[PDB]
Curated annotation (Swiss-Prot), chain A:
Changing residue 159 to G: 34% loss of polymerase activity. No loss of RNase H activity. Changing residue 235 to A: Complete loss of RNA-dependent DNA polymerase activity. Complete loss of RNA 5'-end and 3'-end cleavages. The record marks 403, 416 as: Essential for RT p66/p51 heterodimerization. Residues 46-236 form the Reverse transcriptase domain. This is Reverse transcriptase/ribonuclease H. It catalyses: Endohydrolysis of RNA in RNA/DNA hybrids. Three different cleavage modes: 1. sequence-specific internal cleavage of RNA. Human immunodeficiency virus type 1 and Moloney murine leukemia virus enzymes prefer to cleave the RNA strand one nucleotide away from the RNA-DNA junction. 2. RNA 5'-end directed cleavage 13-19 nucleotides from the RNA end. 3. DNA 3'-end directed cleavage 15-20 nucleotides away from the primer terminus; DNA(n) + a 2'-deoxyribonucleoside 5'-triphosphate = DNA(n+1) + diphosphate.
Length: 554, 412
């Protein structure tokens, strides 16, 4: 006998207070029992399980399921209850590697490790909680009682403990072989390197020798699997990757589900298929808990979907990462709060692509969205490559400087360069810092009757110009904006406007270039037409000049 | 050698905070540091049965090129049982703020000589992530008091007090205060021997067991305080007067005797904003009466240890920043103004991050705790960049202000 190192077990406990499961074993059929008896006898012989006394009071229901009328039966131990009662684990299985982060490996060997899973002992003091019973033929004898000695498939802590046990064993091998990579995916170990297929096979032979130390044998494997690999929805090729084929459904009748299911695909594809849009197609689905609703596609969605299929026409691949070359990220404004980007090291060879959608809000600005997209790409790039990419942005250096030095909030974009590809992001208007000499001064105001919803908006100026417009179905807030709007409509190219509205100032000082409120949009449209605008605020009801609340109090 | 038992607050579990993305350089630094800390028994690898987690990252302190590991124990701290030691809670040294000068020493290393309560260790778990998560993250837990944990100074307090008696007795006028991994040493002795008293204190510390080489000097005796002031002009335009009335109306929420009637009267009529208006007698007297009022201190302003400190910061442009610390609205306990050429002339966020640290430091010296910040920045921008410019061993709390404060100019 060749001594083999044992796999350290992981101390498992049940959640605080809770106790093991105690679930009723259901009546089975004579043939299923005989089926289970056979299976379990064989599992016992292998060490996976062990018959237990009548002491253990815990129980988990077992079942028999036929593998689609084949010459076989399968045992199904339902650990759902036990799982609800098992402590939480460190699911070190989160946030998978993104294909664009991988490096090239001309040689990728696959080794099978199905039999290693059971080579993993179950914490001794925890086994009893895994007890199950094979009912007896006709219920005339006590059912056969068993308990696990190994991680049970379907048990909450199996995925985590297996990965951690496998990693711990591979650890010393990976550390001393820095020129190879190993990845656990299902019952397999994928070992890649970029060594000459000769020095690569040696290294595989060494891994097998190393694994033997723990008694783990891998059927001699040049697996039934060779490039391209289907993994996590992607297709990994020797020197390139892509998402698994995206097939846009053809229909005349699209329902809530069909549409959102169309979203997911477009979203998944957007990581490599450039310029994908999902604003309109996603637009239609806010209010759907019901999924069979045959909803119509606005002419916008049809155009977006047509632009989609087109991009999906040709298959697109992304390259792998080369740590020796720079990382570059390019962004484009797509309209309607939509942005698209590509990250690459060499022109025309993207590592991956992506998109960004403006956050929901009533007022917004292109520069703020460009900035948010930059932050998002920065974080994703830190995740994938451990570094910030150099940005190429459609905004002039001068526009950015004017923006951040005057913005009331602190803001920042990392190293970047202007890329002149329309439509360029710009500032649409810039308020004055000082009152304008020679420009007419408009004192505006508005008010509304909370009950009747009747109101008025208007202005009086230093030249005697005046206006008061009566309004219906309005509020104070809207009348204050309307007043500002009237002043802008009725003034020349340069104008000073005095308001007591903290609300309107709150909006205008946020510098929006677009809004959901058509009233804010009309004001923005007027701002863009002016050459100079000074907006001044004064406290309401302080006997301050021209602040004619009276004209509007009526 | 003996460990003081520790537990969380009744009904709360340990932290389960996500590790945020780290750059390759920070990851490499952490692997090197943690490898060495592991050889030294300070931390130990942990298995999947430990579900807890606290974020970790790396920084470079005041003028050194050596990476320091910083664990973000903010969550664990608010879940760690209020540690009332044999100290009864050391009544914050109200005299530290009055001292001519103060040097801040990093004595966190000392903590690593005291073992941690075995049953509590699991709660200090942290992960060193891998780029693109290609390999599973390295999981560890502490075996000794971790730097940055609330219970570390508390538990090591008894050890610290006796390690300084020779000094405290040798130097009775020097005020020494401890906050987290920092020791604040204040005295009126000029740098010459204030430096040497520290250098003496360093040796004294280096001998009594325990990068200590660093020092950070502050001058709380000459700190930035802020009274409200009004313009002094020979000719006031309508706009100047509208701005004055706005500012006085604002101050009237802080000071009760403020009047604007006589000044707003001057604003009776729809006049051109740039037209010069001569001040009436009544208006000029009201302005004088307001100036006098603004020179007295704010009324009924007191600090309360049971309440949080709140710090508001405004970007004034051109590298200048203003801030106010209070507990009750309009009852400022401290206000200030900043502007320096410290590695951030084109970086808004680096400046704000530096301002946040100076304000916190100031707050520690004065009250013995950190304030809750209201930052003039979008959450996503701040959370993406602040760790690149952080140089302190503690980390305060913060929230974001998304609506422009109308009161910006009135503070500058
Ligand atoms: C994530 C991953 C999945 C599989 C495979 C899982 C499955 N199924 C195989 C390996 C070896 C890895 N790990 C790494 C690590 C670094 N670079 C790479 N590059 C790389 C990977 C696959 C191909 C191919 N073909 C080419 C290059 N892979």
């Amino acid at each position: 006998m060749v001594p083999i190192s044992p796999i350290e077990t992981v101390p498992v406990k049940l959640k605080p207070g809770m106790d093991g499961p105690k679930v009723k074993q259901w009546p089975l059929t004579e043939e299923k029992i005989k089926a289970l008896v056979e299976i379990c006898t064989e599992m016992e012989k292998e060490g996976k399980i062990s018959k237990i006394g009548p002491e253990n009071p815990y129980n988990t229901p077992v079942f028999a399921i036929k593998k689609k009328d084949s010459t076989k039966w399968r045992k199904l131990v339902d650990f759902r209850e036990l799982n609800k009662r098992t402590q939480d684990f460190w699911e070190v299985q989160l946030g998978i590697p993104h294909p664009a982060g991988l490096k090239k490996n001309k040689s990728v060997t696959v080794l099978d490790v199905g039999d290693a899973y059971f080579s993993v002992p179950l914490d001794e003091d925890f086994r009893k909680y895994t007890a199950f019973t094979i009912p007896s033929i006709n219920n005339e004898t006590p059912g056969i009682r068993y308990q696990y000695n190994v991680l049970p498939q379907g048990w909450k802590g199996s995925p985590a403990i297996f990965q951690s046990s496998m990693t711990k064993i591979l650890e010393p091998f990976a550390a001393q072989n820095p020129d190879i990579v190993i990845c656990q995916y299902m019952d397999d170990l994928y070992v890649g390197s970029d060594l000459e297929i000769g020095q690569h096979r040696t290294k595989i032979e060494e891994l097998r020798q190393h694994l033997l130390r723990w008694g783990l044998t891998t059927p001699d494997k040049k697996h039934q699997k060779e490039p391209p690999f289907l993994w996590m929805g992607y297709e990994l090729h020797p020197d390139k990757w892509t998402v698994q084929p995206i097939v846009l459904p053809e229909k005349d009748s699209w329902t809530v589900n069909d549409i959102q299911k169309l979203v997911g695909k477009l979203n998944w594809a957007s990581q490599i298929y450039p310029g994908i849009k999902v604003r309109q197609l996603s637009k239609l689905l806010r209010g759907t808990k019901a999924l069979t609703e045959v909803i119509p596609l606005t002419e916008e969605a049809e155009l977006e979907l047509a632009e989609n299929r087109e991009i999906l026409k040709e298959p697109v691949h992304g390259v792998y990462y080369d740590p020796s070359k720079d990382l570059i990220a390019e962004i484009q404004k797509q309209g309607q709060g939509q942005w698209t980007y590509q990250i690459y090291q060499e022109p025309f060879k993207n590592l991956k692509t992506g998109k960004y959608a403006r956050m929901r809000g009533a007022h917004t600005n292109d520069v703020k969205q460009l900035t948010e997209a930059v932050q998002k790409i920065t974080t994703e790039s830190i995740v994938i490559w451990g570094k910030t990419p150099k940005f190429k942005l459609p905004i002039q250096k001068e526009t950015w400087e004017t923006w951040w030095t005057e913005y009331w909030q602190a803001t920042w974009i990392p190293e970047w360069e202007f890329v002149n590809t329309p439509p360029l992001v710009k500032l649409w208007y810039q308020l004055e810092k000082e009152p304008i000499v020679g420009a007419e001064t408009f004192y505006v105001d508005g008010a509304a009757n909370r009950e009747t919803k009747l109101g008025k908006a208007g202005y009086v100026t230093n030249k005697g110009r005046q206006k008061v417009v009566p309004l219906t179905n309005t509020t104070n807030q809207k009348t204050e904006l309307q007043a500002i709007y009237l002043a802008l409509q009725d003034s020349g190219l340069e104008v000073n406007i005095v308001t007591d509205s903290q609300y309107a100032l709150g909006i205008i000082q946020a510098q929006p270039d677009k809004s959901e409120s058509e009233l804010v949009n009309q004001i923005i449209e007027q701002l863009i037409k002016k050459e100079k605008v000074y907006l001044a605020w004064v406290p309401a009801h302080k006997g301050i000049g021209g602040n004619e609340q009276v004209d509007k109090l009526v | 050698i003996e460990t003081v038992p520790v537990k969380l607050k009744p009904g709360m579990d340990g932290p389960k905070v996500k590790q945020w993305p780290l750059t390759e350089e920070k990851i490499k630094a952490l692997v090197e540091i943690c490898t060495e800390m592991e050889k030294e028994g300070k931390i130990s690898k942990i298995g999947p049965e430990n579900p807890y987690n606290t974020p970790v990252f790396a920084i470079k302190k005041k003028d050194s090129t050596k990476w320091r590991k910083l664990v973000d124990f903010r969550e664990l701290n608010k879940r760690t049982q209020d540690f009332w030691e044999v100290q009864l809670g050391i009544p914050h040294p109200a005299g530290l703020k009055k001292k001519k000068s103060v040097t801040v020493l990093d004595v966190g290393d000392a903590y690593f000589s005291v073992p941690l309560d075995e049953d509590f260790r699991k709660y200090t778990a942290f992960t060193i992530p891998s780029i693109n998560n290609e390999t599973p993250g390295i999981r560890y837990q502490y075996n000794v008091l971790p730097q940055g944990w609330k219970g570390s100074p508390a538990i090591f307090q008894s050890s610290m007090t006796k390690i300084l008696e020779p000094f405290k007795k040798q130097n009775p006028d020097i005020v020494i205060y401890q906050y987290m991994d920092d020791l604040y040493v204040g005295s009126d002795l000029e740098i010459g021997q204030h430096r040497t008293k520290i250098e003496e204190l360093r040796q004294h510390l280096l001998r009594w067991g325990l990068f200590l080489w660093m020092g950070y000097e502050l001058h709380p005796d000459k700190w930035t305080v802020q009274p409200i002031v009004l313009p002094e002009k020979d000719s006031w335009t309508v706009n100047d007067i509208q701005k004055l009335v706005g500012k006085l109306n604002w101050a009237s929420q802080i000071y009760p005797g403020i009047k604007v009637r006589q000044l707003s009267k001057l604003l009776r009529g729809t006049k051109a904003l740039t037209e010069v208006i001569p001040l009436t007698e009544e208006a000029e007297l009201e302005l004088a009466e307001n100036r006098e009022i603004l020179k007295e201190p704010v009324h009924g302003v007191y600090y309360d240890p049971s309440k949080d400190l709140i710090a508001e910061i405004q970007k004034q442009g051109q590298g200048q920043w203003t801030y106010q610390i209070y507990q009750e609205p309009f009852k400022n306990l401290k206000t200030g103004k900043y502007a320096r050429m410290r590695g951030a002339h084109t970086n808004d966020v680096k400046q704000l991050t530096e301002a946040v640290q100076k304000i916190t430091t100031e707050s520690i010296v004065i009250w013995g705790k950190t304030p809750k910040f209201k930052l003039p920045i979008q959450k996503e921008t701040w959370e993406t960049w602040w760790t690149e410019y952080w140089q302190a061993t503690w980390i305060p709390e913060w929230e974001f202000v998304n609506t422009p404060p109308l009161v910006k100019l009135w503070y500058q």
